[PDB]
Ligand binder design. Structure first.
Ligand code: CO
Length: 446
């Protein structure tokens, strides 16, 4: 390899001369080289979701996103229950993550989180044949924040119907149906929410709390006390204090999350294993500054409602200088598009933009540009395509100029001067001039 990976706290490596999907190939390579997890910091949400799908193409290591709440700061609305489930799962497993890539956008990385000690402290496991009564389980579920419904359809719900208890654990893809004989769990079975029908039997399940904050009697008492240390209380029933005191979670309650905890919310960095390598794209400083400014604007413009006085931004988000202070504890690879000058910490990787390969599909000399490239380029060329199907809108089309792409799911399988086919989300291609390989995505042809 043309670069070593940084290891010391605060030690940077800058990799330059990147274009298109090259970044995704590099994060995949880094995750494969690094014994330990990799946390990829993307400048914003659009890039983080793009990078998730692209990196997945080029590695068989797990690629996960820490899901953002997807509300704006001090939103009048609460996050989608599927997002909360995904976040709780990801946060819960993060400290023991050994390999793979966790992608976190800048805005998300700056948001303070519940402490891992809360997740584990409110977690529940149960096993078949284990001594649990339906009534005993219900009381734990209520304190854990779960909502008692007649029929379970969403995460964070449970239903008590006769001798059964249904529940949809936060942090689980599926819901479960438990039957009880003699105050022990007779069985646990996946079930399907749409048909409400029992499927496969399972040995055991784990549940996480229904929110990223406690909502039991003690936490409500804490919330009330800390609310009074901070804000006024009005009598009106639509006042946040009044609602939470009655056991009701108002929409948007997430932005008073700190009031449910007796200590300040930690940085997300507190979850990262000691052997974590950071990687980032874009301009982390300008992205962080833009978010900080954005979060202040939300505070200033939304802080005028006497029913909903807001906590200061520092209670929920790192300042930019705090973010860079946290970053100093970790080795980081910075991925840059530009050609870098010679420096101890810099390596250029040799990716260049593809030439003009655009088709003039109104037939004159239509594929003339693709043609001349394929005849001239004497390394492997790998076409990239979004589906297993439309691998033939292209692949049947490539049989027209004597190209029959062999197909692989690994870049390192492309030997010699072969033409190849890959399925994945890679948006734009490149020419790796060091390895002498070209990737061509559909978007480069159109
Ligand atoms: Co140079």
């Amino acid at each position: 390899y043309r670069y070593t990976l940084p290891v010391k706290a605060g030690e940077q490596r800058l990799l330059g001369e990147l274009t298109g999907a090259a970044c995704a190939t590099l994060v995949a390579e880094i995750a494969e080289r690094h014994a330990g997890p990799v946390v990829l910091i993307a400048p914003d949400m659009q890039n983080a979701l793009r990078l998730h799908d692209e990196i997945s193409q080029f590695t068989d290591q797990m690629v996960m996103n820490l899901a953002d709440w997807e509300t704006l700061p001090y939103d009048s609305f609460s996050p989608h229950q599927d997002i909360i489930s995904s976040r709780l799962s990801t946060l819960y497993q993060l400290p023991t993550m050994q390999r793979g890539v966790l992608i976190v956008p800048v805005n998300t990385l700056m948001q303070r989180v519940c402490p891992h000690s809360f997740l584990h402290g409110h977690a529940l496991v149960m096993k078949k044949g284990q001594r649990l009564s339906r009534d005993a389980l219900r009381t734990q579920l209520d304190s854990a924040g779960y909502r008692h419904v007649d029929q379970v359809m969403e995460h964070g719900e449970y239903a008590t119907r006769g001798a059964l208890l249904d529940l949809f654990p936060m942090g689980s893809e599926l819901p479960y149906r438990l039957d009880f004989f003699d105050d022990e769990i007779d069985s646990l079975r996946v079930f399907d929410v749409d048909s409400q029908r029992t499927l496969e039997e399972v040995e055991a399940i784990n549940l996480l709390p229904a929110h990223e904050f406690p909502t039991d009697k003690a936490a409500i008492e804490l919330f009330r006390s800390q609310w009074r240390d901070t804000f006024e209380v009005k009598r009106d029933p639509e006042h946040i204090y009044q609602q939470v005191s009655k056991g009701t979670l108002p929409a948007g309650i997430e932005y008073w999350q700190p009031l449910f905890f007796s200590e300040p919310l930690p940085p997300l960095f507190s979850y990262f294993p000691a052997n974590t390598l950071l990687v980032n794209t874009g301009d982390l400083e300008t992205s962080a500054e833009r978010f900080q400014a954005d979060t202040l604007a939300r505070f200033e413009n939304r802080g005028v409602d006497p029913m909903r006085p807001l906590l200061p931004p520092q209670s929920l988000w790192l300042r930019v200088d705090e973010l860079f202070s946290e970053l100093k504890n970790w080795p980081r690879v910075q991925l840059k598009t530009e050609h870098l000058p010679t420096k101890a910490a810099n390596a250029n990787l040799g990716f260049q933009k593809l030439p003009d390969l655009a088709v003039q599909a109104q037939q004159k000399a239509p594929l003339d540009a693709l043609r001349k490239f394929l005849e001239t380029f004497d390394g492997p060329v790998v076409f990239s395509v979004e589906s297993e199907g439309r691998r033939e809108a292209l692949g049947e089309l490539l049989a027209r100029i004597k190209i029959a792409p062999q197909r692989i799911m690994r870049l390192d399988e492309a030997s010699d001067r072969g033409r190849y086919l890959m399925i994945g989300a890679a948006e734009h291609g490149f020419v790796d001039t060091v390895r002498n390989l070209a990737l061509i995505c559909e978007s480069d042809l159109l």
